[PDB]
Design a protein around this ligand. Structure first.
Ligand code: CYZ
Ligand code: CYZ
Ligand code: CYZ
Ligand code: CYZ
Ligand code: GLU
Ligand code: GLU
Ligand code: GLU
Ligand code: GLU
Lengths: 270, 260, 260, 270
């Protein structure tokens, strides 16, 4: 019996290859998630096909409807079997699906456009207007937003920290909307914002995007928290413990670190 | 009914206070693990009793007899219900106990005394004039033993063919041996202990290089226990509330008895 | 009986003199290969006639038809007896022809125009803004195609998925393309040609990095020929006498039409 | 049928392991030659046992006796089947045994003791009394010699170059004898010579010894010639072409370069 794997187009997790027009099946995609699923299938023998969520979201319980979307809705309603994708482990998601041990560390970081270096011994020094998340809430000339139906958005909604509460209040009272539908949307806004907009996203994607052409963005401050990416599993399923042990074995053998170095640091010329 | 908790005496995880001789009850202990246990009890709503394992030991499988001794042995044999202690998550333990979600990330680090001409672990393995070891019955020695990378295999071969006994009984004895060796003994230990040690008196040790792998600490429960899901939910809730970060800052960086 | 020799017109291996229109016979050719052929004939004691292959081609197996074309084809089909030319030694050719002992060591090198921010071949593969190719029907393209190292596999994939045609017919055309590209075309060629080119006019190209592998040039003979052992002995004798080094110095470093 | 492999104790080609007392068979030795023979056996299936020549020599036709010694005598007389060892390909040896294509490049280099650096902007510069082989024959205060029953000795005997002829004449007219029986003997003479003696040996062993403790020797000048190490085979044997293709395949696949980097550059701290 073929199980279905749900994944989102994200770099460098899943990429459409240049010769994907004549290729059909699992050979269309390349990146971290595809070979991670390959290693999962090697460890526990099964046949799998990669699928993309219809709305391309991560998952969030809509207010006053109690309906899950994204990859969470793929697995809760029973139309999916496993989600090998950068899905963040949260409290709300664990109560509806089973999460394996995290296979990747992450954190909430800030994206800003790289400032122009000041020429005037003759050393080049870079100055930036944002150094952490403390002053980001204080200043109002720079607007900040998050990704809709993501872990960061919900985390900001249910955060009782004073600075995080102020950030959430500003996001609620922001016009026009500072939220974005995809990671590429926020990155494009950062690009064509001329330093007027800052994007809140995971540290791994931020680091990857910073080190790719045209190489004009940089990450400021530290991670706002510590979380991780896990493999989702529907509640009361038989794949939970097998994928958990598979993730543990892959982490122990160092395959995850090798894939990390291959898919983030090899092609990081600037 | 009361619930027994097994914890290893490790800093900054559990202190036996400072005037413990005149203290009776649950106030004789303090630390990150004590606070975490209190918060877990508050969330779940059960009476908990903090106890120390009879033999100070994190827990590992014995030699060709399938006996668990230490803190994991205290749980797998039914004498303990929960263990709020810095227990590393690894594949072999998951087969015998239930791990909650990790609450402190970490990795394998190297601590020496005062440019540090040692770079990463690549140079450490090929440099033989300096001795280095791990902690008895932990997770680092198991990771080195069962690794398949060639350089990690070289470290494991150096571990097994080492004279005299390079292994240390406790982390405190390991850092004491580092102090008394005066730059001739590196210690392969996890990160959190390294930041805690390097930020206290006399502040003569520091972490060098990066981390060889990424692991974390979990809450161990007996297989098929009724508290695994509640403790997982409590850990996730505390992580969402930022309480874990608050306690980490309080017991690691708040004091800072050195130049930071 | 006369012996026919097949040689590809390559410098500094074989010149067609300078006033070749008024030259008839064996004096119309000069170079390292001509001198080597003369010395082989002197040692063995046979009449040799220097000829150029009809189609300028080092020789490689054709596509799914098992036909050898070029200099190796000139030998395997019985029309040639010996070939004193810079033919690289590889496994596939050894199955069809007999190679003498190598007389000039070499390796795969990279030649660009005038700090050279390219380092080794590791940076060349991951840098895509600059085009690079090999020589048609040689040995470098075969080595890249049949390699199993991942980075060499990346170079081979770039070779096959390249627009426009990056391959060049002759080495002279390759260096001319390097000249006309003005720092936007690296050439993957063997060493000896690289030192010979970089030391002549206009002296605007240089070798960068190291050598990806080590190979050599041999004397090819038909399978089961009566001259393989004599030519091997002659090559070894010339190597012992230092004559090979003398001719290498004469045709590579003696002239030196640049700043050395 | 088990064939016999003859090899000489040479570093880093063959080393006796520290735990060689309780180990018997092919597990006693470690280095380049042992794993090269392992790869040879993997490529062409056969069972092999490693053996050491009785007199520990390389091979030279004794004058007025026409008797071969070393590994050449192991194979010519029929008491050996293959010689996977650093045996140099020469004209005289090819006429008595079959040689495969070279698997390692080499050259004749000079060993001298590393001179003391002169302190008196405050840069440390090293000066040496020998810069090439041209002035080595001219000066007489520094004595030079070679290894007996080696390729270098015979090459100097049958060299018609003026400088090489002068070097051979000096070696013939040297008292006490400047020749050595083993590589370790010449290295020890260089060590306890205080710059009074120079050793002529292959470039690979010279480079390896220079980069090991106590790291007090250095190689001067360039290689006097270009030669190579091959795999010997008795005349008219059936292993010739198989080992030739095996060497070609191993060279093509890059196993030789990997073994080189493992056995010369990994443990080269100084
Ligand atoms: N900053 S830290 O090392 O004290 C730390 C580290 C971690 C924390 C919380 C803290 Cl405070 N929670 C995460 C957990 C939360 C959810 C996402 C990953 C696991 C499940 N694990 S972690 O990434 O190992
Ligand atoms: N270096 S990294 O971010 O790619 C990374 C991150 C992590 C890895 C492994 C790697 Cl390679 N494994 C751990 C897992 C291993 C065992 C201990 C914690 C979980 C269960 N999770 S993690 O701390 O999220
Ligand atoms: N210096 S050079 O590149 O012109 C050069 C290179 C080589 C020469 C001779 C010269 Cl002059 N002979 C050797 C041969 C001699 C004997 C030892 C190795 C082969 C058989 N091959 S080589 O190492 O490829
Ligand atoms: N870099 S090295 O000295 O270990 C080295 C030296 C040599 C290698 C391979 C290596 Cl890795 N292969 C060549 C062989 C390959 C084919 C071409 C020449 C012989 C037959 N001989 S070599 O030029 O003597
Ligand atoms: N990685 C996030 C989505 C992207 C974001 O919110 O920045 C998640 O799993 O929810
Ligand atoms: N802390 C580890 C022991 C290994 C170490 O600390 O080095 C454990 O809980 O198993
Ligand atoms: N010189 C090689 C051709 C490849 C090259 O020169 O790049 C040969 O003789 O086969
Ligand atoms: N490698 C040499 C022996 C050592 C030497 O002569 O320096 C040979 O094969 O003859």
């Amino acid at each position: 019996k073929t199980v279905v794997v749900t994944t989102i187009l994200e770099s460098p997790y899943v990429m459409m290859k240049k010769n994907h027009e004549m290729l059909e099946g699992n050979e269309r995609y390349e990146g971290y998630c595809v070979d991670l699923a390959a290693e999962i299938a090697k460890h526990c023998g099964f046949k799998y096909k990669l699928t993309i969520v219809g709305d391309g979201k991560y998952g969030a319980r809509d207010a006053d409807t109690k309906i899950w979307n994204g990859m969470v809705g793929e697995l809760v309603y029973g139309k999916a079997d496993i989600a090998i994708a950068p899905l963040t482990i949260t409290l709300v998601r664990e109560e509806v699906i089973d999460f394996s041990k995290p296979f990747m560390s992450l954190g909430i970081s800030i994206m800003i456009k790289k400032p122009q270096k000041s020429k005037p011994l003759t050393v080049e020094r870079m100055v930036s207007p944002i150094e952490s998340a403390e002053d980001l809430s204080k200043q109002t000339e720079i607007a900040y937003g998050t990704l809709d139906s993501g872990s960061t958005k919900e985390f900001f909604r249910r955060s009782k920290i004073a600075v995080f509460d102020k950030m959430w209040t500003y996001m609620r009272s922001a016009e026009p909307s500072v939220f974005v539908r995809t990671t590429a949307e926020g990155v494009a806004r950062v690009r064509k914002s001329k330093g007027k907009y800052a994007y809140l996203l995971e540290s791994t994607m931020n680091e990857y995007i910073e080190q790719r052409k045209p190489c004009d963005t940089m990450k400021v401050g530290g991670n706002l928290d510590s979380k991780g990416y896990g493999i989702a599993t529907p509640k009361g399923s038989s794949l939970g413990t097998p994928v958990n042990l598979a993730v543990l074995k892959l982490s122990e053998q160092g395959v995850l670190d090798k894939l990390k170095n291959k898919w983030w640091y090899d092609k990081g010329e600037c």
